[PDB]
Amino acid sequence: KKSGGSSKNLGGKSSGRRQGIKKMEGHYVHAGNIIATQRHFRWHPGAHVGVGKNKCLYALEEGIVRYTKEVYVPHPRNTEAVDLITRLPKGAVLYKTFVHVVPAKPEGTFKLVAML
RNA sequence: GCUAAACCUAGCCCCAAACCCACUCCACCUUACUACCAGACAACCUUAGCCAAACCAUUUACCCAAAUAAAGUAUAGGCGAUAGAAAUUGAAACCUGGCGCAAUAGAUAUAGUACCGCAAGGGAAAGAUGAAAAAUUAUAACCAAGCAUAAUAUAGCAAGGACUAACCCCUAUACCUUCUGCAUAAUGAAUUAACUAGAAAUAACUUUGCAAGGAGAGCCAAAGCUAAGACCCCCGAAACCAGACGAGCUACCUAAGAACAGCUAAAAGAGCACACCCGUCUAUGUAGCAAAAUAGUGGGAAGAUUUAUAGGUAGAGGCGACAAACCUACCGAGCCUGGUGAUAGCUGGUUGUCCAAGAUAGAAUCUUAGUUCAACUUUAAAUUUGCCCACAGAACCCUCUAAAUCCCCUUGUAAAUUUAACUGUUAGUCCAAAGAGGAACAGCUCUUUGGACACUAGGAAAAAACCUUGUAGAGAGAGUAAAAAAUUUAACACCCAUAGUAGGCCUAAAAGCAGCCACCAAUUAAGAAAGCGUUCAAGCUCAACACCCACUACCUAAAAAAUCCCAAACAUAUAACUGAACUCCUCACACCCAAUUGGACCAAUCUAUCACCCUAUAGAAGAACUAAUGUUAGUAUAAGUAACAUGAAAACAUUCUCCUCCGCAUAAGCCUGCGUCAGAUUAAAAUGAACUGACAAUUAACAGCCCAAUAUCUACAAUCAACCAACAAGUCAUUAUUACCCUCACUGUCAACCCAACACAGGCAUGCUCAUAAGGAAAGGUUAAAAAAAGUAAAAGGAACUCGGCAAAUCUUACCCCGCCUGUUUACCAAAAACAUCACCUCUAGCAUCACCAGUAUUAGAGGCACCGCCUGCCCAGUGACACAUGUUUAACGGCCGCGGUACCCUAACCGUGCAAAGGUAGCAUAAUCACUUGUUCCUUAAAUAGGGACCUGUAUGAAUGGCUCCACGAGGGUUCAGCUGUCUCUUACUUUUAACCAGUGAAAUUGACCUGCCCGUGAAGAGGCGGGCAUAACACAGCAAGACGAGAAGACCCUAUGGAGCUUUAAUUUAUUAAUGCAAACAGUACCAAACCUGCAUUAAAAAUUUCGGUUGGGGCGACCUCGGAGCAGAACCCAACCUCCGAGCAGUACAUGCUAAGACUUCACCAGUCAAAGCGAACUACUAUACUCAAUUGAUCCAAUAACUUGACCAACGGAACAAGUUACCCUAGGGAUAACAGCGCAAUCCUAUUCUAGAGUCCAUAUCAACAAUAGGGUUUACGACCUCGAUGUUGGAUCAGGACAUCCCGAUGGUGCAGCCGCUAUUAAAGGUUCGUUUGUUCAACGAUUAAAGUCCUACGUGAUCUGAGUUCAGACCGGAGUAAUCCAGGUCGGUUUCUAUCUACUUUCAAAUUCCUCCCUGUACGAAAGGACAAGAGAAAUAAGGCCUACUUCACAAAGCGCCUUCCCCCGUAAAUGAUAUCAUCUCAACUUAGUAUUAUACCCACACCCACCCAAGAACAGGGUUUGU
RNA sequence: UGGUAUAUAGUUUAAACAAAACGAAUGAUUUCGACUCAUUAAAUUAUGAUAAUCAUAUUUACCAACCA
RNA sequence: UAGGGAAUAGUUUAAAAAACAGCUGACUUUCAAUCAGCAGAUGGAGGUUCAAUUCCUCCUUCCCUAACCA
Ligand SMILES: [K+]
Ligand SMILES: [K+]
Ligand SMILES: [K+]
Ligand SMILES: [K+]
Ligand SMILES: [K+]
Ligand SMILES: [K+]
Ligand SMILES: [K+]
Ligand SMILES: [K+]
Ligand SMILES: [K+]
Ligand SMILES: [K+]
Ligand SMILES: [K+]
Ligand SMILES: [K+]
Ligand SMILES: [K+]
Ligand SMILES: [K+]
Ligand SMILES: [K+]
Ligand SMILES: [K+]
Ligand SMILES: [K+]
Ligand SMILES: [K+]
Ligand SMILES: [K+]
Ligand SMILES: [K+]
Ligand SMILES: [K+]
Ligand SMILES: [K+]
Ligand SMILES: [K+]
Ligand SMILES: [K+]
Ligand SMILES: [K+]
Ligand SMILES: [K+]
Ligand SMILES: [K+]
Ligand SMILES: [K+]
Ligand SMILES: [Mg+2]
Ligand SMILES: [Mg+2]
Ligand SMILES: [Mg+2]
Ligand SMILES: [Mg+2]
Ligand SMILES: [Mg+2]
Ligand SMILES: [Mg+2]
Ligand SMILES: [Mg+2]
Ligand SMILES: [Mg+2]
Ligand SMILES: [Mg+2]
Ligand SMILES: [Mg+2]
Ligand SMILES: [Mg+2]
Ligand SMILES: [Mg+2]
Ligand SMILES: [Mg+2]
Ligand SMILES: [Mg+2]
Ligand SMILES: [Mg+2]
Ligand SMILES: [Mg+2]
Ligand SMILES: [Mg+2]
Ligand SMILES: [Mg+2]
Ligand SMILES: [Mg+2]
Ligand SMILES: [Mg+2]
Ligand SMILES: [Mg+2]
Ligand SMILES: [Mg+2]
Ligand SMILES: [Mg+2]
Ligand SMILES: [Mg+2]
Ligand SMILES: [Mg+2]
Ligand SMILES: [Mg+2]
Ligand SMILES: [Mg+2]
Ligand SMILES: [Mg+2]
Ligand SMILES: [Mg+2]
Ligand SMILES: [Mg+2]
Ligand SMILES: [Mg+2]
Ligand SMILES: [Mg+2]
Ligand SMILES: [Mg+2]
Ligand SMILES: [Mg+2]
Ligand SMILES: [Mg+2]
Ligand SMILES: [Mg+2]
Ligand SMILES: [Mg+2]
Ligand SMILES: [Mg+2]
Ligand SMILES: [Mg+2]
Ligand SMILES: [Mg+2]
Ligand SMILES: [Mg+2]
Ligand SMILES: [Mg+2]
Ligand SMILES: [Mg+2]
Ligand SMILES: [Mg+2]
Ligand SMILES: [Mg+2]
Ligand SMILES: [Mg+2]
Ligand SMILES: [Mg+2]
Ligand SMILES: [Mg+2]
Ligand SMILES: [Mg+2]
Ligand SMILES: [Mg+2]
Ligand SMILES: [Mg+2]
Ligand SMILES: [Mg+2]
Ligand SMILES: [Mg+2]
Ligand SMILES: [Mg+2]
Ligand SMILES: [Mg+2]
Ligand SMILES: [Mg+2]
Ligand SMILES: [Mg+2]
Ligand SMILES: [Mg+2]
Ligand SMILES: [Mg+2]
Ligand SMILES: [Mg+2]
Ligand SMILES: [Mg+2]
Ligand SMILES: [Mg+2]
Ligand SMILES: [Mg+2]
Ligand SMILES: [Mg+2]
Ligand SMILES: [Mg+2]
Ligand SMILES: [Mg+2]
Ligand SMILES: [Mg+2]
Ligand SMILES: [Mg+2]
Ligand SMILES: [Mg+2]
Ligand SMILES: [Mg+2]
Ligand SMILES: [Mg+2]
Ligand SMILES: [Mg+2]
Ligand SMILES: [Mg+2]
Ligand SMILES: [Mg+2]
Ligand SMILES: [Mg+2]
Ligand SMILES: [Mg+2]
Ligand SMILES: [Mg+2]
Ligand SMILES: [Mg+2]
Ligand SMILES: [Mg+2]
Ligand SMILES: [Mg+2]
Ligand SMILES: [Mg+2]
Ligand SMILES: [Mg+2]
Ligand SMILES: [Mg+2]
Ligand SMILES: [Mg+2]
Ligand SMILES: [Mg+2]
Ligand SMILES: [Mg+2]
Ligand SMILES: [Mg+2]
Ligand SMILES: [Mg+2]
Ligand SMILES: [Mg+2]
Ligand SMILES: [Mg+2]
Ligand SMILES: [Mg+2]
Ligand SMILES: [Mg+2]
Ligand SMILES: [Mg+2]
Ligand SMILES: [Mg+2]
Ligand SMILES: [Mg+2]
Ligand SMILES: [Mg+2]
Ligand SMILES: [Mg+2]
Ligand SMILES: [Mg+2]
Ligand SMILES: [Mg+2]
Ligand SMILES: [Mg+2]
Ligand SMILES: [Mg+2]
Ligand SMILES: [Mg+2]
Ligand SMILES: [Mg+2]
Ligand SMILES: [Mg+2]
Ligand SMILES: [Mg+2]
Ligand SMILES: [Mg+2]
Ligand SMILES: [Mg+2]
Ligand SMILES: [Mg+2]
Ligand SMILES: [Mg+2]
Ligand SMILES: [Mg+2]
Ligand SMILES: [Mg+2]
Ligand SMILES: [Mg+2]
């Protein structure tokens, strides 16, 4: 009988992006394999780890994935990060979580091919 | 032992072969089956649609002249669904058979007959001996249901375990379907027999053959190829189209006919009133007399009347005084056949045994009742890891610094992935936990984690979701698991008090105690005062001393609903026992999940070959029925029930009694259908006969069946036809000339009769009779209960009944609304205010040989309004029409304002301003007119939501969509005087019918099976069937209607379906058709130019056609929403919903290598799409965090179109998008749904109600006489909501009548406590449910108001108790009006008039709770107690009444061997809330859940009933039957 | 019963610390008056809290309703 | 309860203008009319934009519509 009002909120129907870690600590990866996806920089690229447009971390070499805590030093051109470290107390250091790939195989080997 | 059972032929089916094709005579196209006369009418012309496309709109296979192959190829196509060649290639061919049926099969077939239908057309059923029936006292018996032989004994899904024993004991909630879940009161089923339902490609698998080849040309082939085997149901709509058949009913019309007494007036669409026509109201009837009737009452009855006969109009239609009427007994558009096995995402159904595995995140979708992908699940195969998991490791911003997860060697285990091939599931329930919404309600809704259920067992009482427990068998063995409810409450001090001082101040006063300051001090000891109190004072307590032991607790305070409480019981014998399908023991072992899937066996039948008292191995298939409101047949149940029938006596000769609705004849129709003989047949009836067989019969004068030609003639009604007067202007006639001498044939003739399925209470024209000279019988017999039906009479009253004076009686006044009037309509729920109508007005048309019309603008046609009377106002902006250059037109569609201010208020002549085409004029007005509204006032009634007259901005009155008056009329609606009455107070008596009993005959719906109880509880939420209790030998008959969610009709309300149809339109598409215009074509004439018809191509109208009308949704509608991104819910890998909470997007800017290419990866849970990228080529570069731009989303598939190419194109926003389609249905239809609303129940308790706790405030003071705020704690289930659990193959819904059952939260009556209780009246609380709780006016009302009363006129529940008991005013279909909405169809919370209420009782229950009675008033006490006065009791006692219950007839009254009331008689106990004594714990006191005493209690008292084979028969104050009483009154 | 509005001099009426209006008085003015002008008197439904705002009950207004 | 629209000088309208009203004068014996001058406005709050009656958002007042079916 008595009619009621409607909800005034629209949208909010987006689905999950299925982002996060794809390769955990100790996993074996091949060159090109995506290690992690993210919308903001939660994990930073370390050794033999590339970063794409969308902050996607991928393996540059074949090997084992490792996660570490390292000291963060921004690039001087980056003004937002450089305007933050100049306001820190003398003695403080910023830390961030980096992901690395420890290579497994060597670049190659020298083989005998002829005896001239 | 009956009924029955059983059979093998009749013939039929599919092929082959072969082309096929008459006859005695007579008759047959007119009314077919009819001997015989003047004619000329003639045949051809695209099938459409269902359906498919999941809608639909282009489109959607249908032999078309050779099997195979080419080939499902070329090609076509909303390039979708699907459709689909050819060239070319090139085979075989002996009718006489059957792994076909065998009487529900096979042809429908014993036959296109019987029968149904006007017609087209539809369309059956069944038989059974034997060699011989010229062997008929024959051919044995044994078998379905149903019965009989032979009824029954506490108790219960009917059995099982058993047992000496049938029953008694113990255990046990029918089946199918459908669901989250059914004993469910959800579906289907009476039962027996028979019949009745899974059809196939692709690929793959299995088993042979051959093998780089296979195959009996085609084709395939990187082990393939050939062959075989093995997988895809049944019934059902409303509809659509084509072609036939129908106007003997009905609607209208044509031709020529008929009927209408009597009276009044004599003029009549006049009145009274027969025949006749219609069908107003009431009752009855409701499977009937009747698929629309009967009785009574009513309307009309010389006209727009009624009616017989023949003919005409036919479904894309007709007809229509429009009711969406009627067109052969369901017309929103007929019937039949066919297309047609229409379609159905929907319901129902789906047939042998046994084992095994087996419950599922989600996405898209005109999609959420479905489907596809994924996920889960199954089988086969290959391979190698899967599950469990150690450290280490995974973010800052930030609020819960969460339980956890992700990753993961070891370890313990045995699964996992991949490949191949498939189906089903995709409508979820509770519990725990984390949360969202709602109300920190819901058996509520939405997500997540896990569990259980949808499988077994045990337990929690019964029990889907809680606990225990799972792997299957036998056992008269054992050990265990879970598993039983505990609690009982409030005593408390005694004793004593002098003084500075009335401290100071304030104050009228302030003295311990209104306020401010101080708060010192006397006495052994006592506050410049802690609580009451006083106007201020007085006055009473507390803190003090003394005395000596109060020598305490300071942890909780209640309860009430409705049929009947609910196991029975128990405080004391030593913790162990009982207890499963778990586990052990002896033996055995494939032997307990829906859908789905895999596998092992098999009945019968046919065929091949065996076999040979009924089998084997194989091959085949119409291969298996406890269920489809299934089909046919048989037989039960209801049920020997409902219902049906014959006037009397007698010599069967006749007579008597009573009806007379008639009767006789003709026409029509029918066709031998009560004449004789006979009968085994038949009626209720083993004389009669309408049935069977034979025989006979209706005789023409009545009637029917007619006529030579040509030309020609026919002005003057009828009505007693004469006066007279009319309009509606009428039914009757010849002559001339020619031709023409035979004559009585043929047919109908009966009856008790036709149309309605009937030997039907219906329908049926005319003449005479008009109450009969003709024709008929209401009672089978008895009894004389209820209820019911039809009548008669009724004391006193006289509408108090009721929605209403319905009905009955009686013979009557006045008024209002609507419509003028007679008239017409929804055959079968509406007769009316609706339609028509005289009159008025608008529009169109200047004319002839089939309508209008044999007419000509004083005409005809299309429409509106509705006689008359007074009137019909303003608007042409918009739409339309006309005219076309403006323009014209509303008696065409339609429309006809607002703001602010001013005379005290109200109002505004007036002032200011804007808009419009014009601004609602006259009039009327609380209306039949949205709501407000029961508006105000007068009349009317004792009392008025009624009615009438007025007042009235009515903001939604209003003028030919006609407005306002006024005669007459009305089965219209409303009010009323008077009278009348059984309508009512308040019923009663009698008669008839029915009824019951006897006799005869003998139905229907219904039926899972039944060995068919009550209470409470439980439960799919309302139990005869479950749990706990109570009750209980068996059995008929008559009554009742509370229940069996009783019977009946697959709900008509509501929702759903990409289901239908009707109507409307500014929905989409289209103009075939019709009309007009233009061009062309055709055609001619003297640079100009050609009539029309016809054809083609365009344009514009008209009138139509086809198709559709999205979804989500705490039912639908309205509103809102539909794609993408960020945040929270979701805290830590990923994922996660709500019509949940917030913020955003549908770009922009910079580059111009945002160039080419390419490993490896992520992925919005599928697909599609989307995303990140090393190296490399080529560039750039030595500075630019440059080498995939910044930016969060910043977006759109295929086809198609454009384009030379590159490339571009949709707010396809319903955003995975249909190339293009809206409304309405109450005129509606079909399929379903309790998956989904409205009534009811159930849950919940926000709202509502009640109580308690708290003590601010009110009450002069005074918190608790009384009332009560802010809040708190519980309970109730009467309101309004919310939820969607049972029911939509039906649970009938308001109020009232009838009868009431129950709760107490008590309205009166009773007993008590308190009072701001003097008394009389009251307020409040405790206890009490035995008894009682009125009549009236308006309203449909429940309520409410009012009038008069009462001791009181209680609150609630019982399916808002009760419709198989009633009522239908209201609500709530089909008709209609008003206002409003809309272009219209149509619609509204609106108002108004009208509108069919079925049921024969099978079961349960009940049908004498036998018998104590309640209250008011009067007198008296008493003018007493009380009291200033006014005023005015209780108790005791007495008397008289009312009601109720139970009886009776002396009188009265209705009546009369009797029954009744209006009359008379009788009527008997109590209830418990408290108030008081004695007296301990606690030596006072204290009514004591202390022992005890009293008010103060009934084994409710007693009363009633109490014997028993004379009993055939009769009588009765006894009674339905039976029974009972009497007969010492059995001629 | 329900909610929704409600209140201001003596009345009438904006607004609450109280504004204007009718009437009253007073003068100014006129030969005297009316008009006019000026001046004066005159009020917040009352109860409890915030401290002047919410409540509290009244007060009259205002619409709502058995049901099928 | 749901939904749409509106708010501009004291008043009524327009896309920051007019009209009156008001104030100041002239004309008239006086008033009115007339003539000549002067003033006054974007309900409220918040935000974008250099700039907002003119782009959005919430609140107040008022208006209109719907509030249905059994
Ligand atoms: K369809
Ligand atoms: K047959
Ligand atoms: K059920
Ligand atoms: K049912
Ligand atoms: K059932
Ligand atoms: K069934
Ligand atoms: K005819
Ligand atoms: K069903
Ligand atoms: K569906
Ligand atoms: K004092
Ligand atoms: K006959
Ligand atoms: K009849
Ligand atoms: K006679
Ligand atoms: K009729
Ligand atoms: K009538
Ligand atoms: K016009
Ligand atoms: K009236
Ligand atoms: K009146
Ligand atoms: K009109
Ligand atoms: K009438
Ligand atoms: K009587
Ligand atoms: K009954
Ligand atoms: K029923
Ligand atoms: K709901
Ligand atoms: K869509
Ligand atoms: K609720
Ligand atoms: K139902
Ligand atoms: K005591
Ligand atoms: Mg989100
Ligand atoms: Mg989501
Ligand atoms: Mg289709
Ligand atoms: Mg060919
Ligand atoms: Mg046959
Ligand atoms: Mg038998
Ligand atoms: Mg038993
Ligand atoms: Mg079955
Ligand atoms: Mg259900
Ligand atoms: Mg059950
Ligand atoms: Mg039952
Ligand atoms: Mg059903
Ligand atoms: Mg098959
Ligand atoms: Mg069609
Ligand atoms: Mg047709
Ligand atoms: Mg006829
Ligand atoms: Mg006839
Ligand atoms: Mg005629
Ligand atoms: Mg006459
Ligand atoms: Mg007459
Ligand atoms: Mg008459
Ligand atoms: Mg007619
Ligand atoms: Mg009509
Ligand atoms: Mg109609
Ligand atoms: Mg079908
Ligand atoms: Mg199994
Ligand atoms: Mg779509
Ligand atoms: Mg689904
Ligand atoms: Mg591992
Ligand atoms: Mg799913
Ligand atoms: Mg639930
Ligand atoms: Mg003192
Ligand atoms: Mg003093
Ligand atoms: Mg003092
Ligand atoms: Mg004293
Ligand atoms: Mg005092
Ligand atoms: Mg003091
Ligand atoms: Mg003391
Ligand atoms: Mg045991
Ligand atoms: Mg076991
Ligand atoms: Mg076993
Ligand atoms: Mg066998
Ligand atoms: Mg066999
Ligand atoms: Mg079969
Ligand atoms: Mg059978
Ligand atoms: Mg059957
Ligand atoms: Mg019976
Ligand atoms: Mg009978
Ligand atoms: Mg009879
Ligand atoms: Mg004759
Ligand atoms: Mg005769
Ligand atoms: Mg008789
Ligand atoms: Mg009889
Ligand atoms: Mg009777
Ligand atoms: Mg009488
Ligand atoms: Mg009355
Ligand atoms: Mg009267
Ligand atoms: Mg009455
Ligand atoms: Mg009458
Ligand atoms: Mg009339
Ligand atoms: Mg007249
Ligand atoms: Mg009718
Ligand atoms: Mg009628
Ligand atoms: Mg009329
Ligand atoms: Mg007019
Ligand atoms: Mg005005
Ligand atoms: Mg005024
Ligand atoms: Mg007027
Ligand atoms: Mg009205
Ligand atoms: Mg009356
Ligand atoms: Mg009007
Ligand atoms: Mg009108
Ligand atoms: Mg009348
Ligand atoms: Mg009439
Ligand atoms: Mg009998
Ligand atoms: Mg049944
Ligand atoms: Mg029960
Ligand atoms: Mg009986
Ligand atoms: Mg009965
Ligand atoms: Mg149904
Ligand atoms: Mg459709
Ligand atoms: Mg269709
Ligand atoms: Mg659509
Ligand atoms: Mg919908
Ligand atoms: Mg809804
Ligand atoms: Mg909408
Ligand atoms: Mg994916
Ligand atoms: Mg590179
Ligand atoms: Mg979509
Ligand atoms: Mg998507
Ligand atoms: Mg209607
Ligand atoms: Mg139906
Ligand atoms: Mg339900
Ligand atoms: Mg309900
Ligand atoms: Mg029920
Ligand atoms: Mg409750
Ligand atoms: Mg007080
Ligand atoms: Mg639910
Ligand atoms: Mg049923
Ligand atoms: Mg009580
Ligand atoms: Mg009572
Ligand atoms: Mg009821
Ligand atoms: Mg009943
Ligand atoms: Mg009625
Ligand atoms: Mg009515
Ligand atoms: Mg109307
Ligand atoms: Mg009537
Ligand atoms: Mg009835
Ligand atoms: Mg006395
Ligand atoms: Mg004592
Ligand atoms: Mg003592
Ligand atoms: Mg003077």
Residues 6+ apart with CB under 8 A from A63: A28, A29, A48, A101, A102, A103, A104, A105
Which nt is closest to the CA of A14, judged by C1'?
B1125
The Å distance, CA of A4 to C1' of C52, is 40
Tell which strand D nucleotides have any atom below 7 Å from a protein Cβ. Answer: 1-3, 67-69
Domain A10-116 has CATH 2.40.50.100: yes
Return phi, psi of residue A79, to 5°.
Answer: -80, -35
- Token pair belonging to A49: 């780890």
| Encoded amino acid at A52, one letter | G
Question: Contact, A61 vs A25, CB < 8 A?
Answer: no
Name the β-bridge partners of A103: A63
Q: Is A65 exposed, middle or buried (0-12, 13-18, 19+ CB in 10 A)?
A: buried
Sketch the domain layout of chain A as residue ranges. Answer: 10-116
**Resolution of this deposited model, Å:** 2.6
Question: Contact, A29 vs A35, CB < 8 A?
Answer: yes
Tell me the C-alpha distance between A65 and A30, whole Å.
10
CA A15 from centre of chain:
22
DSSP A63-107: EEEEEEEEE----TT-HHHHHHHTTSPTT---EEEEEEEEE-S-S
